[PDB]
Amino acid sequence: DEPKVLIAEVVVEGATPELEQLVYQVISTRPGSTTTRTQLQQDTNAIFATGFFADVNAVPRDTPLGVRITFVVRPYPVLRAVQVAGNQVLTQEKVNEIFAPQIGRTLNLRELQAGIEKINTFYRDNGYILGQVVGTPQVDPDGVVTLQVAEGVVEQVTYRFLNKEGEPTKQRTRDFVISREMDTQPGVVLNQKTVQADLRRLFELGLFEDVQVALEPGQNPRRVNLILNIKERNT
């Protein structure tokens, strides 16, 4: 863990005033302090961990005073808007409301992740069990952030009839009999409350020994094929 250098000045470049005090607060390197390469590296890690910066570099130069450490920092842009692709039950207006407190100051990726968590909580609490933000947020240099969601859209619903052993068997009941009990239909976003309700209506018909629900990925792999595995009461 050698060698050590004495520092004469520390400057922060590239930060707005609000953030520049933060940089000084989180680093340990001061004028008058002895540092190594490792510690300077840890200082850039600490600054990066604040969540405000796209890029952090520590640069040492020789000045008339002695050694300068310049921390060069490239903040994320001021946040101007957050827009979403692939949404249906999550409205752009709800997205605007979640992120309103952040608009007009430098974007912070920890705070963005807290908003992403608010979106996933909106899906989960409203019963859209599959719904969530997917991918990495796109941050454009003009301060507009784009997110993707996959809400759990039902591409198709497939009935599979099975005998007692669990092998395929000839269907007796007509498709309409089942379909007309179900609110879960192609094009809706899967909701665990509606699935439940649907299975209760299928039970109230008195026709099936078992109905089990299984999901397979759609053709669009962000969507689902809802499978009903159905064992009908014999003759």
Whether 146 and 207 map to the same domain: the answer is: no
**What's the burial of 85, exposed, middle or buried (CB within 10 Å: 0-12/13-18/19+)?**
exposed
Q: From which experimental method does this structure derive?
A: X-ray
CA-CA distance, 183 to 124, in Å (whole number)? Answer: 19
Whether 102 and 176 map to the same domain: the answer is: no
For the chain, what is the domain count?
3
Phi-psi region of 36 (alpha: psi -120 to 50; beta: other; left: phi over 0): beta
Point out the domain boundary residue: 137, 152, 167. 152
Residue pointed to by tokens 């101007």: 80
CA-CA distance, 122 to 131, in Å (whole number)? Answer: 9
Whether 159 and 234 map to the same domain: the answer is: yes
Whether 197 and 137 map to the same domain: the answer is: no
CA-CA distance, 219 to 223, in Å (whole number)? Answer: 7
Point out the domain boundary residue: 103, 131, 152. 152
Tokens of 229: 């595995």
Going by C-beta distance under 8 Å and a sequence separation of 6 or more, which residues neighbour residue 74? 14, 53, 54, 55, 56
Whether 139 and 208 map to the same domain: the answer is: no
Whether 2 and 44 map to the same domain: the answer is: yes
Radius of gyration of the chain (CA): 28
Whether 65 and 9 map to the same domain: the answer is: yes
Structural domain for 15, as ranges: 1-76
Whether 70 and 83 map to the same domain: the answer is: no
Whether 62 and 108 map to the same domain: the answer is: no
Q: Encode the chain in three state secondary structure.
A: CCCCEEEEEEEEECCCHHHHHHHHHHCCCCCCCEECHHHHHHHHHHHHCCCCEEEEEEEEEEECCEEEEEEEEEECCECCEEEEECCCCCCHHHHHHHHHHHCCCECCHHHHHHHHHHHHHHHHHCCCCCCEEEEEEEECCCCEEEEEEECCEEEEEEEEEECCCCCECCCCCCHHHHHCCCCCCCCCECCHHHHHHHHHHHHHHCCEEEEEEEEEECCCCCCEEEEEEEEECCC
Whether 203 and 235 map to the same domain: the answer is: yes
Q: Are strands 144-150 and 81-85 parallel, antiparallel or unpaired?
A: parallel
Q: Are strands 154-161 and 208-217 parallel, antiparallel or unpaired?
A: unpaired
Amino acid (1-letter code) at residue 39: Q
Point out the domain boundary residue: 128, 152, 176. 152
**Is-contact 181 194, C-beta < 8 A?**
no
In this structure, what CATH number is given to the domain that contains residue 112? 3.10.20.310
- The CA distances from residue 25 to 16, 59, 81, 229, in Å, are 15, 18, 29, 60
**Is-contact 133 146, C-beta < 8 A?**
no
> Can the peptide bond before residue 217 be classed as cis, meaning omega within 30 degrees of 0?
no
CA dihedral 76, 80, 85, 91 (to 10 degrees): 140
**Is-contact 224 216, C-beta < 8 A?**
yes
Whether 157 and 227 map to the same domain: the answer is: yes
Q: Which of 118, 198, 123, 120 is nearest to 157 (CA)?
A: 198
Q: Are strands 224-232 and 154-161 parallel, antiparallel or unpaired?
A: parallel
Whether 41 and 101 map to the same domain: the answer is: no
CA-CA distance, 163 to 231, in Å (whole number)? Answer: 6
Resolution in A: 2.0
